[PDB]
Structure 1
Amino acid sequence: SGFRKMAFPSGKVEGCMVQVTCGTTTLNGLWLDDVVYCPRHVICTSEDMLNPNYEDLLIRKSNHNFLVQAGNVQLRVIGHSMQNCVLKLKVDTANPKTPKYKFVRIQPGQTFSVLACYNGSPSGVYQCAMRPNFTIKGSFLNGSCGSVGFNIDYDCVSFCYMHHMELPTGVHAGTDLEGNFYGPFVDRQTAQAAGTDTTITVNVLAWLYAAVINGDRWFLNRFTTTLNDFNLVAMKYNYEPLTQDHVDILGPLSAQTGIAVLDMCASLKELLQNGMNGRTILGSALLEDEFTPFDVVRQCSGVTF
């Protein structure tokens, strides 16, 4: 029993975190094999950020201008290149702690673990989701740039996010490990804002199934709905549309609890129109949307890494 916001064990990622310094700027790098990956804005001053020309700033740099520190050991930079908004530093030593890994680009609604780092040293681990507006609600202070997001599929670390910036609303933006931003953001000090956000419907449904598995059934009712009628109600409350793909993905949980997906949709409709009436679900007074159907199955079955 129990249902907690759970992150993947971070050990395989901790062994890759390094400190990258370029002049007065210090941030975090990811050391895999003989390459260190970090945000390209490490080569900028506060002044450059206003309107940076990254190739022009990079051409003026030599290998010895980048200081890479792994623990208390200094690594030697023997090459440098740029791919989108990520700087790739070739080093003389391959990381002996390099795990089995892949670079993956995730979709909004997908969750991942974040290993927050400062000066190449991991400080904490938490779970979060890529919001429909492409931002993440992280917890990051100055110096956290270069911190990474990941998932573990069997024994392989899937790196999906690298941290670059904080928006005025306190939410966060970054790139995949190939340097492509999630969302309409740019790595420049200029006016940028998160768009209006929506609730991840398939995730709230998965979390309602996790509550049923744990004994919270007060919100169940005898009613059902059509997929079209549920989507008209979802549009009214700023919830993402539910597709037939989402219904198929919820199939295993629907069979385990004996509650059809459209039967659980009728419960969600009543919760939206009437509220919780002083009651809670899994210790929460809000409808939680940062657990995917896979996360629910994983936590209710004990999958190890």
Structure 2
Amino acid sequence: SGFRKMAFPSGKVEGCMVQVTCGTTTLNGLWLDDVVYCPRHVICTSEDMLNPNYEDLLIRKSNHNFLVQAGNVQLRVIGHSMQNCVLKLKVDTANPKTPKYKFVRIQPGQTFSVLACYNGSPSGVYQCAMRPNFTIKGSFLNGSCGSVGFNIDDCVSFCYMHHMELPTGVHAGTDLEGNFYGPFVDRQTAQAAGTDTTITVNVLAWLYAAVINGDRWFLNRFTTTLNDFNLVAMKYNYEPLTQDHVDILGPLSAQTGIAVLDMCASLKELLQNGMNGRTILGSALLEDEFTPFDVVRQCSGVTFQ
């Protein structure tokens, strides 16, 4: 029993982090077989980030100017390439700690784990969800660039590499192909993020976990339809709710005896009349970073390699 925000076990990932240096800046890297992945702005000094031409700056760089330090042992860069916003730093010795990995581009509303690192060393792990506006709300300091977000399946799925922190404090990054989430670019200029809406489908799965774990005073008396719900949600800035969202909620509906539309009616009155200083699962706010799949994993305890 109980419910916590669990991150995935970080052992496989923390064997792949390397220290990447190019000039004065030191950020992290992802060591896969014989290609080291790290943000391409490492070749950039502080003045460069303003209006940098990336194609020209790498030309002024050679194979002997990047230092890939794996703890004690140092690697020798043997070939470099730029994939959108990422450097593939090919090296000589292939990593024996390479796991079954995958490269995935997540969709908004999905959750993963982040191994925050500095100087190539692991410092912490926590769970976060991609916001609909393609940003995240983590804890990143200077030098934590190159920290990776992953999901463990017996396979690791890397889906995020932190690049920059917006002047609003929120964080932005790319996938392991080098393609940013959102409209962001890796230069130090005012880049606008949009309206951040609450993830409705994750909130409804969180309520089901609450019923499984006991907190159920919110089980209301009214019902509602699916247009009636989305009308209320768009006013409270909640994303519209689809039929595929209902199908994803199927197993939770079966286990608890509460129909998906009946739970929506409880949320509708929750939004309109608040929670009244009363908590659900130990929180005074509506949580939107538990996907429906996540609730099943924790309440049923599936494990991994």
Bin for the TM-score computed over the shorter chain: over 0.9
| Alignment gaps of 5+ in structure 2 | none
Q: Normalising by structure 2, what TM-score?
A: 0.99
- Aligned partner of residue 190 in structure 1, secondary structure: coil
In 2, the alpha carbon distance for the partners of 1:289 and 1:216 equals: 17
In 2, the alpha carbon distance for the partners of 1:50 and 1:221 equals: 54
Query: Could you list the per-position Cα deviations for residues 236-260 of structure 1 after superposition, in whole angstroms to 9, with x for gaps in the alignment?
Result: 0000100001010001001100001
In 1, the alpha carbon distance for the partners of 2:181 and 2:196 equals: 14
Offset at 1:278?
A: 2.0
Query: Could you list the per-position Cα deviations for residues 72-96 of structure 1 after superposition, in whole angstroms to 9, with x for gaps in the alignment?
Result: 1101110000000011100011010
In 1, the alpha carbon distance for the partners of 2:55 and 2:277 equals: 57
Please report the RMSD computed on the Cα atoms of aligned residues, expressed in angstroms: 0.7
Offset at 1:48?
A: 1.3
Confirm or deny: 8 A CA contact 1:168 1:193 kept in the other structure.
no
Confirm or deny: 8 A CA contact 2:150 2:158 kept in the other structure.
yes
Offset at 1:290?
A: 0.4
Offset at 1:195?
A: 1.6
In 1, the alpha carbon distance for the partners of 2:177 and 2:203 equals: 30
Task: Show structure 1 runs of 4+ deviating over 6 A.
Answer: none
In 2, the alpha carbon distance for the partners of 1:267 and 1:216 equals: 13
| Alignment gaps of 5+ in structure 1 | none
Confirm or deny: 8 A CA contact 2:18 2:120 kept in the other structure.
yes
Number of matched residues? 304
In 2, the alpha carbon distance for the partners of 1:16 and 1:69 equals: 12
Query: Could you list the per-position Cα deviations for residues 49-75 of structure 1 after superposition, in whole angstroms to 9, with x for gaps in the alignment?
Result: 111111100011111100000011101
In 1, the alpha carbon distance for the partners of 2:119 and 2:43 equals: 16
Confirm or deny: 8 A CA contact 1:68 1:74 kept in the other structure.
yes
Confirm or deny: 8 A CA contact 1:76 1:92 kept in the other structure.
yes
- Aligned partner of residue 78 in structure 2, secondary structure: strand
Q: Normalising by structure 1, what TM-score?
A: 0.99
Match of residue 108 from structure 1: 108
Confirm or deny: 8 A CA contact 2:167 2:190 kept in the other structure.
no
- Aligned partner of residue 28 in structure 1, secondary structure: strand
Offset at 1:148?
A: 0.3
Confirm or deny: 8 A CA contact 1:223 1:266 kept in the other structure.
yes
In 1, the alpha carbon distance for the partners of 2:22 and 2:245 equals: 46
- Aligned partner of residue 52 in structure 2, secondary structure: coil
Offset at 1:222?
A: 3.1
Offset at 1:168?
A: 1.4
Confirm or deny: 8 A CA contact 1:114 1:149 kept in the other structure.
yes
Match of residue 131 from structure 1: 131
Offset at 1:170?
A: 1.1
